[PDB]
Amino acid sequence: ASTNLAVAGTTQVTQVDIVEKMLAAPTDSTLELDGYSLNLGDVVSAARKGRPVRVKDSDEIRSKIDKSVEFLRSQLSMSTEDAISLQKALLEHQLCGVLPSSFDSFRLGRGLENSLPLEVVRGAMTIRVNSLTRGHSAVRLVVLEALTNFLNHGITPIVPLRGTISASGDLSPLSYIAAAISGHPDSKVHVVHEGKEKILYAREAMALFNLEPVVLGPKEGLGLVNGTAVSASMATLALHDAHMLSLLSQSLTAMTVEAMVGHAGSFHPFLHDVTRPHPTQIEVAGNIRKLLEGSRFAVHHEEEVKDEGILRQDRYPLRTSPQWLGPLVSDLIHAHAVLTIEAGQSTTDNPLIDVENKTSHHGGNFQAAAVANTMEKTRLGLAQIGKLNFTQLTEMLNAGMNRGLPSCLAAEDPSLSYHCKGLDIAAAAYTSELGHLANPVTTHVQPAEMANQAVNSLALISARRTTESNDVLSLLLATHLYCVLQAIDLRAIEFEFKKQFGPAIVSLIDQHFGSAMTGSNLRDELVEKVNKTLAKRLEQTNSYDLVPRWHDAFSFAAGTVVEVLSSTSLSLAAVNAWKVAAAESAISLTRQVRETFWSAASTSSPALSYLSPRTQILYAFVREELGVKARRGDVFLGKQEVTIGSNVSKIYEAIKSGRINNVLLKMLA
């Protein structure tokens, strides 16, 4: 068992360290199970990535396994049909869950909703083997090999989704696994054969692979069916996914600060390391600080240090992000430590055999409360991440709050383009759904089995709900990522415009008013005050169409001219002429800057000029590798383009598949 905290789940280990180690798990080389070494990255590799799995090729391991079986046998001989019958009675009553009776009920894209996901089953078989290699259980090596042969030949039992309370542990689903390797006549398994997914009787599948059904002996029924492997499996997958979504939340925080031209100062070490040293608060601030280095969108503390109700500081979704995310990150790191012991270093069947002291012990290690605990806490965390990113996104999509970004992140006139409005509403919906999911399952314990099982963990049910919260959070975070990238591109257009328009203002002022200001000290003042009036006004006319927007801005500026140049000989006609020429100039320049953006490939986006080098990684991933482009607008284009949803879907799919995972790692390196 590893003492490296990056494996095992304090400032001496971080979520990024944990993720890096998980993502480094081999997928090609064989996972050798020894009862103690198995880690959560390994579990995910076997469950999801088809990694080969075997009991460690070791005389010590074999001898430990064999000696527990022998102990039981010899104890029995000193104290076989009926033992075989007892195991059959154990399976009989536990094969009691609901599955489709026939293929006749299957429909396109539907039909296996009442069965456990194949990956969960694979993860369960892996953990089950590991937990029996420890020598406490008296299950034969040939039985463990039956499981590893199922794994290595891609035979995955079809197991009901529901029916366990996760005490004598995950009895029912583990009984389906045991029935499958033993060739129960009514056991079904999933295989790929001749290029097709098939569901076959267990004996048919085994015959394709020349595998022999096992016949369960003394203690092997309880050895296989008592335990926590199914909930631990699903919980491990859910925690893996939650870690990624936590890192993505941090990344989206950074990109939002950039789109909002907000303050990187929120993440300064003084505000965390020095003043409020919660290790995971320090961690999160440091990740976001790292991501914002080099940004030309975010405002930097080290540069900053050089009667209107003016909002000068960022609102809480950005400014309190480390303080909001830190606590839940600590919970995810704690959960990692718990599940590592549970999945990798625990014997969870019963009774358990102490061969050295010739004793069989009656305990409770199948009570999966440690697993349920991780899932309750993680699901609440997912809801908290979701609330944060929703509040960041909805601020950014609010024209009144978003520091002058176009209404709805529309690229063209907002009168006929509401681009991200639907997504604002979707984000709300996902967030609401997360809130209800977050209520605990573990307060709903029933007096099961004649109250023998009066306390039961409900870990698998909890794991299921947390897996659904992962899914909903992925929809929300895919949505946010879609939006922030649009905002980044629109901000970059604003920056390109300002490069050209700053000089244009000065020039028009000189052309129109220079002679009237000759011999005065009015020019500096005028340029300064006209710029300030334009800036302040434009921030608030971000829902106006282009033409009236610019006439409005310069109308306001003309009032500033009246004041600043009130001593001069200028006619009202001359000031109005300046106003009109300046507005026309701004309107033309805007159109030209937009055309320069849209007429070139996304690989030439001006955003690449301003993004942090680290946040550019994620930008490039979505825009180039995923093909998700900025959206100019169906009405402007006179074309109903592939939908916003179709594009968000591509982001979501990259989250769910884990394609985005190495991207997050590279950014946070």
Residue (of 395, 378, 387) closest to 330 by Cα position = 378
What string marks each residue from 513 to 552 as x (binds a copy of itself by CB under 8 A) or -?
A: ---------------------------xx-xxx-xx----
Dihedral angle, C-alpha 56, 59, 62, 67, nearest 10 °: -150
Instruction: State which of residues 60, 70, 92, 528 lies at the interface with a copy of itself (CB under 8 A).
Output: 92
**DSSP state for residue 212 in the 8-state scheme:** P
Residues 401-440 close enough to bind a copy of itself by CB under 8 A: 401, 407-408, 413-426, 428-436, 438-440
What string marks each residue from 165 to 184 as x (binds a copy of itself by CB under 8 A) or -?
A: x-x---xx--x--------x
Shortest distance in whole angstroms from residue 586 CB to a copy of itself: 15
226 is in an annotated binding site: yes
449 is in an annotated binding site: yes
Instruction: State which of residues 26, 646, 666, 669 lies at the interface with a copy of itself (CB under 8 A).
Output: 646
Instruction: State which of residues 3, 79, 80, 101 lies at the interface with a copy of itself (CB under 8 A).
Output: 101
110 is in an annotated binding site: no
Distances (CA, A) of 103 to 110, 163, 190: 11, 22, 13
Which of residues 369 and 506 has its CB atom nearest to a copy of itself in the complex?
Answer: 369
* Site for a copy of itself contains 575 (CB under 8 A): yes
Q: Are strands 53-55 and 359-361 parallel, antiparallel or unpaired?
A: unpaired
Q: Are 565 and 526 in contact (CB under 8 A)?
A: yes
Q: What angle do CA 661, 664, 666 make, to 5 degrees?
A: 110
What string marks each residue from 194 to 213 as x (binds a copy of itself by CB under 8 A) or -?
A: ---xxx--------------
Q: Burial-class residue 208 by CB neighbours within 10 Å (0-12, 13-18, 19+).
A: middle
342 sits in which H/E element: helix 321-344
Distances (CA, A) of 439 to 5, 247, 335, 475, 580: 30, 23, 18, 20, 60
Q: Which residue has the tokens 């400032």?
A: 11
Residues 377-396 close enough to bind a copy of itself by CB under 8 A: 377, 380, 383-384, 387-388, 390-391, 394-395
Instruction: State which of residues 126, 253, 266, 378 lies at the interface with a copy of itself (CB under 8 A).
Output: 266
Q: Are 390 and 428 in contact (CB under 8 A)?
A: yes
Shortest distance in whole angstroms from residue 473 CB to a copy of itself: 12
Residues 28-67 close enough to bind a copy of itself by CB under 8 A: none
Number of H helices, E strands in the chain: 25, 7
* Site for a copy of itself contains 100 (CB under 8 A): yes
SS3 string, 497-554, reads HHHHHHHHHHHHHHHHHCCCCCCCCCHHHHHHHHHHHHHHHHCCCCCCCHHHHHHHHH
Shortest distance in whole angstroms from residue 599 CB to a copy of itself: 22
| Beta-ladder partners of 353 | 360
In one-letter notation, the amino acid at residue 325 is: L
Strand ranges for 39-181 from DSSP E? 53-55, 156-157
Select from 241-249, 333-341, 590-598, 608-616 the region that touches a copy of itself (CB under 8 A): 333-341
Which of residues 142 and 215 has its CB atom nearest to a copy of itself in the complex?
Answer: 215
Per-position DSSP letters for 295-332, written without gaps between them: -SSSBPHHHHT-------S--HHHHTHHHHHHHHHHHH
**DSSP state for residue 624 in the 8-state scheme:** I
Q: Are 628 and 482 in contact (CB under 8 A)?
A: yes
Instruction: State which of residues 68, 287, 346, 469 lies at the interface with a copy of itself (CB under 8 A).
Output: 346
* Site for a copy of itself contains 635 (CB under 8 A): yes
Instruction: State which of residues 45, 253, 348, 615 lies at the interface with a copy of itself (CB under 8 A).
Output: 348
Shortest distance in whole angstroms from residue 657 CB to a copy of itself: 9
Cα separation, 233 vs 151, whole angstroms:
14
Instruction: State which of residues 2, 75, 500, 576 lies at the interface with a copy of itself (CB under 8 A).
Output: 576
Instruction: State which of residues 281, 466, 467, 615 lies at the interface with a copy of itself (CB under 8 A).
Output: 281
531 is in an annotated binding site: no
Instruction: State which of residues 140, 240, 289, 465 lies at the interface with a copy of itself (CB under 8 A).
Output: 465
Select from 206-214, 313-321, 492-500, 520-528 the region that touches a copy of itself (CB under 8 A): 313-321
Count of CB atoms within 10 A of residue 381's CB? 25
Q: Are strands 31-33 and 53-55 parallel, antiparallel or unpaired?
A: parallel
Residue (of 371, 380, 385) closest to 438 by Cα position = 380
Which of residues 128 and 190 has its CB atom nearest to a copy of itself in the complex?
Answer: 190
377 is in an annotated binding site: no
Cα separation, 262 vs 278, whole angstroms:
24
Shortest distance in whole angstroms from residue 620 CB to a copy of itself: 20
Shortest distance in whole angstroms from residue 609 CB to a copy of itself: 27
Q: Burial-class residue 307 by CB neighbours within 10 Å (0-12, 13-18, 19+).
A: exposed
Shortest distance in whole angstroms from residue 29 CB to a copy of itself: 27
Q: How many residues bind a copy of itself (CB under 8 A)?
A: 219
Distances (CA, A) of 232 to 98, 223, 338, 613: 22, 16, 10, 38
Shortest distance in whole angstroms from residue 517 CB to a copy of itself: 12
Instruction: State which of residues 24, 106, 514, 515 lies at the interface with a copy of itself (CB under 8 A).
Output: 106
Q: Are 253 and 393 in contact (CB under 8 A)?
A: no
Which of residues 498 and 532 has its CB atom nearest to a copy of itself in the complex?
Answer: 532
Cα separation, 120 vs 190, whole angstroms:
13
Shortest distance in whole angstroms from residue 313 CB to a copy of itself: 5
Select from 89-97, 488-496, 582-590, 599-607 the region that touches a copy of itself (CB under 8 A): 89-97
Select from 142-150, 309-317, 502-510, 592-600 the region that touches a copy of itself (CB under 8 A): 309-317
Residues 473-492 close enough to bind a copy of itself by CB under 8 A: 475, 478
Which of residues 70 and 354 has its CB atom nearest to a copy of itself in the complex?
Answer: 354
Residues 433-452 close enough to bind a copy of itself by CB under 8 A: 433-436, 438-452
Binding residue ranges: 226, 313, 319, 350, 421, 449, 452
Binding residue ranges for (E)-cinnamate: 226, 313, 319, 350, 421, 449, 452
